[PDB]
């Protein structure tokens, strides 16, 4: 059983909530869900840069590295189906809303998190909700992250 | 039978539009005239086809050109490309960052079209556009630079 | 490419429209769009028996065994996760709706022609929107019914 | 080391519950007192034991039933069934329908909670049901005749 | 391509063996003639070909029909059928009862020949024995019903 | 450490079981001593248990007799038996023509589920049935002449 | 295309060289013609193309031949029997018996080079010897009667 | 732990028999006495112990040499040795040549029993026939010259 | 038809070159003339191109030279080269330093484009870098002699 | 398991050398009974042991050393880069030359250094390619490589709470 | 088609190369003839090519010779031989003992390239070095005895 | 756990020799009493063994070194070296020229022995030959110095 994390977990509000009160100690307390879990969490790198601009520290950031893979995807040998280039490009067009970096950068980390996912054949995990139409188009399992933590408890 | 995928830049952009006739309608009318003479396939995405159309095309010039220039899908669907593709779609519209937005998106979708359409078939894509020119260069798809187009008709019998 | 059809391809509207006005039409137009794609059509058996008493006879039955592969899900030898069950669980729940045998029924060509899916690795169609959701639940490459004739149209 | 995994039959369900007491409390203290000095380990799902504390048990009891009987819910996720279970469950299902079909809904899920747990544990599971025992045999689950549920907690020593 | 599985009621039993012709052998030629016209390979079992030729079939028309169908027994071994297939297979055995024991038996031998070899080539099998079908459907075998399987060969080509 | 699947025909056929004692009841009884002081696991069928208890079986000795002997079935459901071994179950029926059909189709089920269930612990087959033991010998099943069971319970000490 | 797997009995028994022309030389000579004019690829392993000249054939024809049929040996390394085919193979070499035992051994490894070969290219074996056939009827490897070659050559052109 | 499988030339050629002791059954004997204080688990094929027992075993030794020996024959099924040994076995049936010949095919199936289940646990074969050791240290089987066997469960224990 | 992969040396370096003619732009003529009547394909990277344009080609030629020469660079993506590749790549880094930072990678990517688009189209590679025809024997390119050039397009009819 | 691929960075840069222990020896002693412990299996390749037994490490910790770190090669035969990775090398090859540079053999050498860092790291890249195992290691140039690759990666800063934290 | 895998061996060696003609150069010469005018593509290995390039080839037949021998060499990654090979190799190595010993590992390896290329291609090697073909037959190539390669050319066209 | 292929060097050359004690067969039993104490298996292939036990061994060290050292050798067939691994192989016996190349030949098949057998089982290859040391670094087997060996098994009891 293989997960997909998303930078929206620990970033999107009743998602970030519902783990915890506070950014740190959800990210600790999600660290004591694995640690314990059988399954295996991979991040994406430019998502755990994004991340660690924001708030990771050395302390945390042991135990996150030690129990989150940081992988970005096996870049290659990798083949999607042609839909998602033309699929994609509607995501982008809904990613437009200064806002141009942002917005194709967001889009960027999106593909990359979701070719991981397809390339592990792994469960992405995202808040975001385009991604997920796209993600569930391209054939890659989903889990709502409000409920990603009711499922690392009863896999302990 | 050499087939080629044309970019509607080769009825439009100068410097390519020129050498062929100082008029657009006779540009088009004697493309098709070195048309049906050498041996080769024309294609062209839809999309791009019904533009052009409604860019400078009258039916008089779209019966011909359907006729002769096969006009056909870029087959969008079941088609297995590779992953960066994407990747470089995303660097593209980095540099095509510049109602504007809407057409510079849309312009992207139409030479995505073109450029799937070649790889589709093998084709060659004849293009003005340089930065379409790289990615297709990257991406593996024969080229020709449009300003021999027409010195392509002939010496092609 | 590899496809699972359902009977609600050819009975529910909204998929029953757009294909001809004539049912038996409707699906002579499909197997013509069929017949020279690249894809391939599968359906379980217990779901054609349902299509074939009721409408479908030997004027068309013939062609649509030479272009549709009717073949009961590989039962036997296949495991799924187990967490699948409660969401067949909540699956009955939505359809508790003389009603007992249909809703069972129902099901029951529901896990048919979804576990088929998910052993082909295919792309699923059907009408009803809560098999969508459970495909989406377990991880099933599923596209809209209308869009399955959007995908025929660009294959042939 | 034995391990058994219990149903709410068991207790609930006389026929089985008998020939521990008469008096319920009673009944589930002796076999309290049974257990533990016994060489096995008993399991119940978490919500069978809650629903068991909303049927008869009191919290004055329980601190030791929670110290001899470990209230686990099944490892529900990641636990890779065969498939082809599914489709005995909506047998099962027929042989459960009898606003009744509500209750025997929560009749099935909270079965096949027990049902899976077994399943996972590979412990030998107790169940007064005919239509559960039917089911553990037919999937692969240790059985016991609960009638003997006492004659198996005596030679457990 | 498209692979099909033999079965001795194709050429014994009528009502598929009619919709090719009145005159039995005429109609397995009229049969080998649709085959090699179509683009679907033909197997069909050791044991049923020797069945089938002690029958009817005579040395002008096995020139033909060892052309087309591939007279290969199963794979035989390094197959790992489902183990509760056995038990499906004895309930046939259970309902195959109808002194003709010998017929009984060679009958299942030469059935599970058949079902075997549709299970291992993924194939397609047309066969009119109602018992055998289920027992194709149920375990997984492609089917068609060969009242339309003249419907089918034309239909291929 | 040690696993036994038996038959009821270890208990039943009358040559192996006076070797545990004269009187039947008995025997079973010294059995279970010689059991529970082995380092050995006892399985037994479902089907296997029952018919045995249409034979003998009553709650004094039934209680202690399920403590050590798991009543388990195999698991049918998702297991990879070899197709050889269908095959071979054939010729089985052929030594099991024995009216008596009906039995006999039955002996399959019961018998089969023996064998299965060795064959999923890898556990060592006792059965005083000649044909069992060879069909076992054959699908490579670990064996043990039952007129030695009694030796080979008392050495495991 | 269609692949044939030959053995020297084709060409050495009275039986299957017949049906061509009498002369048994130049019956493989039309053999030759028969094909390069049939769809087929026609393999025959080293060693029995060793034996074929030593017995009967030469040079003149010799040509012809290799031109025609791919004189190639199994690949015997990086092929996986299944385990059972050796006890079968045990039952051949016993009814092998018959300057008489190494004669009996030499013949087998032809035989078991020509088995193998049409198991790996999954080819169509033909042979004279009913021992041959018997054991691919079994193994599972695709048989044509050599008595009704020459009609497959022909309907294959 | 370590497997070792057993040859019956183990209890028949002297020097890997006489080093236990002298006298047939007391070397047997405390060959038991050695084993079931040895932390291995010692095998032998069913028709190797067959053999023995229609030699020497006699009802008295058997009760312990069934408890410490597990009789067991190869998974002839769903074991897919590799191709080449089958050329390899022919030539040590060739050696074989030398009644005689029925006798020399029943001791070819009973090595290839010993030999497949070596290969099949990668257990250790310890056998005194030199054409044994050969052939498996060839297909690669774990191997103790059996002159050591003694002092393998000397230690070990 | 052959595929031939050309070399920006095949044109510069006078050595292959002379015999075509010995001035660079009617060589480059008599090589276009050779083409178009041979039935092969030439292909050249588009890099490679570029590279050529800069140096003596100019737009008179080019029209017809990009009629019969393919401008297509290899498929990077979707292409698996194997691992020794680009350790043997490091030698090639290690040769190309002796003006000196860049003119090393601009070789090493024109290089590479080249061979990976032999190795892609599986052409004939045409160079004559020495060291890029060393590389190109050893991961299994095609090649011919540049010197020979000129005769394998006469040839070629 | 988790299985890590070390790079002789890991024992000579600073950063990650301290955060161990100070003395240099005594640092890579300390690391070895972190590991030894933990619950992952440590790869690192037969060169790169060659020149860090050339640096640093002597016969009295080897008997440690190669007891909980696996010195195995990468399998190059039978295994595929992926054909972009060959481009994308050459960037990476483009970036250390300009390192080299940014008096004749002074910067001369630093390519030649440079050059055979080129081969070192690619061993440690396709081992950790090829084990789908992670990579720690300090040059930057590492990182990013392995980055777009696809290398499961892991700061080297963390590389104690990693082993900590690991049993 | 019916690909060749030559060896300098068919150009060198008489007695199969004198069936081209007399004189060796012409005897070359018409080998060529023969060739592209066969419906067959002749591979030969770099390392062979060259070898044969010293002693005798010239200038002339060299153009008309790469017009249809593909000088390829084996594709050496990504190829995997099965383990066997590399002991056969060795006996190879072995009967070379026969300066000397630097040209037997030399022409070790010149063999290994032609017997890996016509294994890759699935080609039919031919050569005259007899312990060549026992390898290539044993390894399981194809094969054509080189004294009837003329006509093994004729009615190939 | 942790594997480890030894060698005859690892009991031949000192620098390992040595380390353990000053004279063979006390060197020997030294490391068998550091085996059986660490958590790491020893192989060791036959032919090597075989060797050794022609220098030194006896039966008092020989009876532990089998207890211990299991003696197998590698799973030739099933195996699939990749093939540069040949080439590779070929300028090792290069290296290997030092009446006496057959001791060269003989070593290096028995080289061949132990490094494959650590490439199978992905087992830590021990050797005191450099070559060896170098073949096995190049083809990717794990290492350890085995100067450290003693060391080794220690810290790993």
Redesign the interface.
């Known amino acids: ?1 293989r997960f997909v994390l998303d930078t929206s977990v620990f970033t999107n509000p009743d998602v970030y909530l519902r783990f915890d009160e506070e950014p740190m100690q959800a990210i600790s307390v999600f660290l004591g869900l694995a ?1 314990r879990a ?2 295996e969490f991979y991040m994406p ?1 430019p998502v755990y840069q994004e991340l660690c601009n924001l708030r990771s520290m ?1 302390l945390i ?3 996150f ?2 129990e989150v ?18 699929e ?2 509607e995501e ?2 809904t990613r ?1 809303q200064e806002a ?1 970096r942002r917005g ?1 950068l967001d ?2 980390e999106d ?1 990359d998190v979701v ?1 991981l996912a397809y390339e592990l054949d792994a ?1 992405l995990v995202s808040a975001d909700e385009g991604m997920r139409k796209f993600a ?2 391209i ?4 889990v709502n992250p409000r409920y990603l933590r009711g ?1 690392m408890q ?2 302990a």
Chains 1, 3 share one sequence.
């Not at 893979?69 to 033309?86: D, G």
């Open positions: 059983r640690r059988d399954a790198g050395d950031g042991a135990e590295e030690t893979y940081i992988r970005s995807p096996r870049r290659f040998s990798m083949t999607i189906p042609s839909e998602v280039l033309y994609f490009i982008v067009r437009i141009m194709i889009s960027r593909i070719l469960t569930e188009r054939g890659i399992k989903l499922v009863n896999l």
